[PDB]
Ligand binder design. Structure first.
Ligand SMILES: Nc1ncnc2c1ncn2[C@@H]1O[C@H](COP(=O)(O)OP(=O)(O)O)[C@@H](O)[C@H]1O
Ligand SMILES: [Mg+2]
Length: 320
């Protein structure tokens, strides 16, 4: 149910030239689950569920996702997380570019094509919401300025399921529709009266896709949730006051996410969902028969081996 993989991005301009850009990440010839880090002259090795090299394409990465996405059609819930330091490629993996679309566009494209193949008795509705978690505050990335703080409430039917009053939902039917939603989101982040955080690297951004089906011949209903999560950057911040508090919020929320996934993966009795807004919000898409994919992004170069080490230790911790 719970899988942890790493993606090593290629060298970027930010990596520079000279000794700092020397390669530090190598691999095993036979086992694609192994990653080797050279850290301050000493080798450290890690085992994950799968490791993607700097040659891995967006399509290669999506092969880890396509089966999860089709299960949402059937009513399963899924979370996909991108984790790692700012600059390691989280947004590239999740959103991609026009020339190289990421997981978000490929997942929605696959949902639309799967829906189009269902029998004529079925009616599917696909909607998207987008939310920001900044310093444990939840706001609607697609909401009207000034965006209020949102509450996470228990459904009043006693099911124990959670909902977010006032979170906006956009109906989408095509990749062109989702592109229009994403463009609106980008513009909406920096309006004059916004309460959204300008620095995307310091907040968790969640794209919540809801897939609702009804078999119109019987009234049978399915509800699948696909949560596409571009996490705040994990890098350590050297010792603002407000910058430090922000870094501490991020550290505690990411650590809580790791605690929750590790507890779920090991099928321990107590899963501490309540310890963070992110894990509490997503608990119905993490527990039970839900499926989770954690994608740990790392830089390949010597300059970043401290943060690569921290990121890969996080990956091994949640695996386990
Ligand atoms: N797999 C990849 N292939 C090519 N370029 C990448 C890849 N991952 C990241 N990049 C590039 O690295 C830079 C930082 O990536 P970004 O997605 O902004 O990282 P993050 O969201 O983790 O801060 C961007 O310029 C992006 O184009
Ligand atoms: Mg980013």
């Amino acid at each position: 149910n719970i899988r942890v993989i790493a993606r090593v991005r290629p060298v970027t301009k930010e990596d520079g030239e000279g000794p700092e850009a020397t390669n530090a990440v190598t691999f095993d010839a036979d086992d694609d689950s192994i990653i080797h880090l050279l850290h301050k002259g000493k080798p450290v090795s890690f085992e994950l569920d799968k490791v993607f090299s700097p040659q891995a394409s967006q399509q290669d990465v999506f092969q880890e996702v396509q089966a999860l996405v089709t299960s949402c059609i059937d009513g399963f819930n899924v979370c996909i997380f991108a984790y790692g330091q700012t600059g390691a490629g989280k947004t590239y993996t999740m959103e991609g570019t026009a020339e190289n679309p990421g997981i978000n566009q490929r997942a929605l494209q696959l949902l639309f094509s799967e829906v189009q193949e269902k029998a004529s008795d079925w009616e599917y509705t696909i909607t998207v919401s987008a939310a920001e978690i900044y310093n444990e505050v939840l706001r609607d990335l697609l909401g009207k300025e000034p965006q209020e703080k949102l509450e996470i409430r228990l459904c009043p039917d006693g099911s124990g399921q959670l909902y977010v009053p006032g979170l906006t939902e956009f109906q989408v039917q095509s990749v062109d529709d989702i592109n229009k939603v994403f463009e609106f989101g980008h513009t909406n982040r920096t309006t004059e009266f916004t309460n959204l955080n300008e620095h995307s690297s310091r907040s968790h951004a969640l794209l919540i896709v809801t897939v609702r089906g009804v078999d119109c011949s019987t009234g049978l209903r399915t509800t699948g949730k696909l949560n596409l999560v571009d996490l705040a950057g994990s890098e350590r911040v050297g010792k603002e006051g407000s910058r430090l508090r922000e870094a501490q919020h991020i550290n505690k929320s990411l650590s809580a996410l790791g605690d929750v996934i590790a507890a779920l993966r090991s099928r321990q009795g107590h899963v501490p969902f309540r310890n963070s807004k992110l894990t509490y919000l997503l608990q119905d898409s993490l527990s039970g028969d839900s499926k989770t994919l954690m994608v740990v992004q790392v830089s390949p170069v010597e300059k970043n081996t401290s943060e690569t080490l921290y990121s890969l230790k996080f990956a091994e911790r949640v695996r386990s």
